[PDB]
């Protein structure tokens, strides 16, 4: 992704849910910190195209394995801790468009190991609200807003 005027790189985030009130939670490669899939937008790519590229490259899935249930409307931004800014044009954060997907294929279709440098080691199902308290603090405000925006849909499926 290319950094914009203000130092924010455009990215997409992905919340994948099932019908049990759960979302797909993934362990950052070589870490004990966990997060949702997120990926950059290449020039020319739409947000939806970037999302399906992230879905393929780091989750191993096709359009055909999911259905899009919702999308956030505007960019949601987080700023990197000043200690984590890699030095230009220097990136100070991300602006993100988020997607809620329902997994309709089997769990075994998920493959997080196809890249030579995976985003993730692997994943597990967690309860819907578990991500807000478990994600790194500088993303917590973005996560709280996304999970609130998506909450009605996931809970209705879970009934
Ligand atoms: N949960 C976490 N705990 C500690 N550090 C984290 C973290 N999540 C992210 N970071 C740090 O924040 C930096 C920026 O992370 P992100 O904004 O998630 C993009 P990235 O993971 O570096 O991949 P990218 O190549 O797509 O940019 C990373 O170098 C990472 O070390």
Author numbering: 0 to 86, 89 to 160
Quote the original article.
Finding a correct substrate is especially difficult for the Escherichia coli Nudix hydrolase RppH, which triggers 5′-end-dependent RNA degradation by removing orthophosphate from the 5′-diphosphorylated transcripts. In Escherichia coli and probably many other bacteria, RppH converts diphosphorylated 5′ ends of transcripts into monophosphorylated ends that accelerate subsequent cleavage by the 5′-monophosphate-stimulated endonuclease RNase E. Escherichia coli RppH can also remove pyrophosphate from triphosphorylated RNA with lower efficiency.
Neither structure contains Mg2+ cations since their addition to the crystallization solution resulted in the loss of electron density map for nucleotides, even for non-hydrolysable substrate analogs and at pH values unfavorable for catalysis. In the absence of Mg2+, the map for nucleotides was of high quality although the occupancy of nucleotides was refined to lower than 100% in some cases. All of the nucleobases bind in the protein cleft where we previously observed specific binding of guanosine at the second position of an RNA ligand. In this cleft, the nucleobase is sandwiched between the guanidinium group of R27 and a hydrophobic pedestal formed by V137 and F139. Pyrimidines are locked in place by a hydrogen bond with S32, while purines are likely held by stronger cation–π interactions with R27. The sugar–phosphate moiety is oriented toward the catalytic site and forms several hydrogen bonds involving R27, Y77, Q95 and K140 in all of the structures. Thus, the NTP-bound structures demonstrate that NTPs interact with RppH in the same site where the second nucleotide of RNA binds RppH. In this position, NTPs can compete with RNA for RppH binding and inhibit the reaction of RNA substrates.
